[PDB]
A paper describes a structure:
The characterization of β2m structure and folding dynamics gained considerable resonance when the protein was found to be responsible for Dialysis Related Amyloidosis (DRA). The mutant protein is the etiological agent of a previously unknown systemic amyloidosis, whereby patients carrying the D76N mutation accumulate large mutant β2m amyloid deposits, especially in internal organs.
In detail, residue D53 lies in the middle of β2m D-strand, one of the edge strands of the four-stranded β-sheet (strands ABED). D53 is involved in the interaction with the MHC class I heavy chain; however, in the isolated β2m, it is totally solvent exposed and devoid of interactions with neighbouring residues. The D53-to-N substitution does not alter the regularity of the D-strand, as both D53 and N53 share the same region of the Ramachandran plot (Phi/Psi angles of residues 53 are -109°/113°, and -129°/98° for wt β2m and the D53N variant, respectively). D53 is the only wt β2m aggregation-protective element (namely an inward-pointing charge) at that edge of the four-stranded β-sheet, according to the analysis by Richardson and Richardson. However, even if the D-to-N mutation leaves a regular β-strand, unprotected and potentially prone to aggregation, the D53N mutant does not show any increased aggregation propensity. The D53N, D59N and D98N 3D-structures superimpose well with both wt β2m and the D76N mutant (RMSD values in the 0.10–0.17 and 0.63–0.73 Å range, respectively); most of the backbone structural differences, relative to wt β2m, are located in the protein region comprising loops AB, EF, CC’D and the C-terminal tail. The D53N, D59N and D98N variants, which match very closely the wt 3D structure, show a similar Bz-score pattern, with positive peaks corresponding to AB-, CC’D-, DE-, EF-loops, and the C-terminus. The crystal structures of D53N, D59N (this study) and of D76N variants match closely that of wt β2m. Their overall 3D-structures are maintained without rearrangement of the loops or of the secondary structures; even locally, the mutations are quite well accepted, with minimal rearrangements of neighbouring side chains.
Residue numbers in the entry: 0 to 99
The structure:
């Protein structure tokens, strides 16, 4: 058996075709087993509507999740990714760096 803790990256992107759109992304990478729980948070509150969730694997024991949705950040709001996985004794919360 093998288990690996996910790497977690949280960042924003504007699609070049629609630049006034902004997306909040959580890239959760290289984890095993594939069982996982991943939420986007806004001011501590779970975001129910996340239109994109994109799972793949490389080696049979390495999984990759892109989790993202459109959003309209203000300098007031705090956003984060919250991840649960068997390798994590507590939920891991990664805050969005507003400049990323």
């Amino acid at each position: 058996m093998i288990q690996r803790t996910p790497k977690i990256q949280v960042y924003s992107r504007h699609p070049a075709e629609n630049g006034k759109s902004n997306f909040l992304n959580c890239y959760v990478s290289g984890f095993h087993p594939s069982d996982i729980e991943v939420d986007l948070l806004k001011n501590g509150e779970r975001i129910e509507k996340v239109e994109h969730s994109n799972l793949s694997f490389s080696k049979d024991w390495s999984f990759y999740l892109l989790y993202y949705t459109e959003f309209t950040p203000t300098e007031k709001d705090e956003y984060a990714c919250r991840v649960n996985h068997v390798t994590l004794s507590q939920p891991k919360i990664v805050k969005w760096d507003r400049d990323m």
